[PDB]
Amino acid sequence: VSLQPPPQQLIVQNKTIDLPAVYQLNGGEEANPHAVKVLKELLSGKQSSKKGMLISIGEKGDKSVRKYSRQIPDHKEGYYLSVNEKEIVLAGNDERGTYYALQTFAQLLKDGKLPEVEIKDYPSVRYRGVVEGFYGTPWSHQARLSQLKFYGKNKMNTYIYGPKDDPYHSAPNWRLPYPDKEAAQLQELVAVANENEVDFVWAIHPGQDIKWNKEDRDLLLAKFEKMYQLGVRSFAVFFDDISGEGTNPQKQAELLNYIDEKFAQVKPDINQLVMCPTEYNKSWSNPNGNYLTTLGDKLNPSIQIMWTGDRVISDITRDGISWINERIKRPAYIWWNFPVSDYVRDHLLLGPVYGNDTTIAKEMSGFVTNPMEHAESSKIAIYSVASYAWNPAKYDTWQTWKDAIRTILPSAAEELECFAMHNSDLGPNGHGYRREESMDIQPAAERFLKAFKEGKNYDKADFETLQYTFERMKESADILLMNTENKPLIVEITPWVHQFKLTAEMGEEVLKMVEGRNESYFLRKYNHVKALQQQMFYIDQTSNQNPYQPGVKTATRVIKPLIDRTFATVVKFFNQKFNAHLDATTDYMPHKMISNIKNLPLQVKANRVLISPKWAAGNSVEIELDAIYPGENIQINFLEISTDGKEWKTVDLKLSAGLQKAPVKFVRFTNLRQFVLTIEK
């Protein structure tokens, strides 16, 4: 088996022992009852009695396992697991340890058969898990219930609740208790987290409008107190992405220490207390100021401080963690902003987890991932982060990705792999963060395109690889659409699956245009491609219509540019050959734009028509829409309207011109970061 996470020490013998038909259970009444419940499910159908094979379960100190005390590792959440033909031992250093032994035990089980094996295990990082900390639609209740079962299975002990658009988490209603319905749901979440050995850390994000007074201090404590009554035993205060007084390091420290002394140390049973600083990565840290060393010196040392790395989106390196730890005077609690896609919402990020140093476990208090608003889809990265964080020294990126996918979707693992490996890069974005994509076919794609562009003979093998890949892509899309094993996963990814299928069909038809040996056939494929472009645009305009990066982009890094440039090239070649004037545009645009900028394409985004973001006065620009619409405004960062081209009407900027529902078809500007017409849909 590929045990995930991989244990710290494992010795296996070529000898299997059947899951005994007859077992004596020793320590079921004293061991972690969440661990016992898991064992008893694994043993349904088998007989209990005082005869037959002994199964020893308990926490170090319990009589059930005092026998094995010096084999039980002396770490938080550590365990000893042993299988031989005589007996089974499942012995945690603590209750969570025992639960974790059962999670490893369940993976060892196959057909009703166990390998003869000896395991001593424990996590290299103390706090491991997920921070629901993104902008966008927060995870549904059902998605959260499923997350927490998944965290228990992969030994993640931490779930930090902090969805930026939950109004009771953030400003201004952080001051209000949750309504009954949500409160009842959070209470269930906390109970379920408890059953899966996950710390539910409730975060609050009061900083944008906090006053540094008695009144807001008390409301914050009253809100924590409410959460505590709901079952919450860990807490966080986040000061990220704010301006104003709330950024004050002295005051933040004083408030966290107050929470610490008057609440966290006064209750009998509060576990983590965590804060997110305002300077939460090195690039936003101001060496002109003293923000981080002030937190470092003033914040009670048991309080965690979160950190995203050298940048808002970054991977964690030795130099980076060393840089921060020196300032905050404790090991940073890593907030890793992957696979969060809230700033590239038209991309799914389903690639492997990589780039984080595997030797620096001792330098971090915790490691949590900030995932996508697509909960199930995020499990690929989550499963992987759990593997990494439990045993970084043995972290195998690619094998963990595969095991993740095979866990999440066993009936269609190879199809999900196919889809995921072409849906991993983020594309260009303000943070500069990129991931690999489509790496297996990138060299064949690069050689083919350079040869074809230059009139040299492409390698046949390269052409067949591209063919194979498009074929595989369609099979994967089609199978994934109908898969019923993980319906919520398929709901999340479906718009991208449709777009991926179309991408593959377009690719096939373009390769037929390359090989095409007569005019007529070439023309049929050309027209087919144009129709597929238009379908891609339709999906782009009707799926995933969020306000920030609407639409659906897929296979962007390698596959789409290859198809686009191949199509442009072969149409150029066809035009030269047949003295024809076929249009070589690669993305369908129903509206037109002319200028003297010329080839900055237009884009449609919701009810906006914009020029893709050059200060020469060549003289004019005109946009023609495909119909008459009521106009809202025109926005510009470094002007007339018409319905027919002939009668015009000047509008005055400010830069922003209101149109006041004036019918618009044409827009002209005479005498660029932004140039956007908003119309009424």
Ligand SMILES: CCCCCN1[C@H](CO)[C@@H](O)[C@@H](O)[C@@H]1CC(=O)NC
């Ligand atoms: C300019 C605002 C950037 C927001 C930065 N990150 C994420 C970007 O994915 C986003 O999920 C947001 O919640 C988070 C804030 C943050 O990084 N806190 C440690």
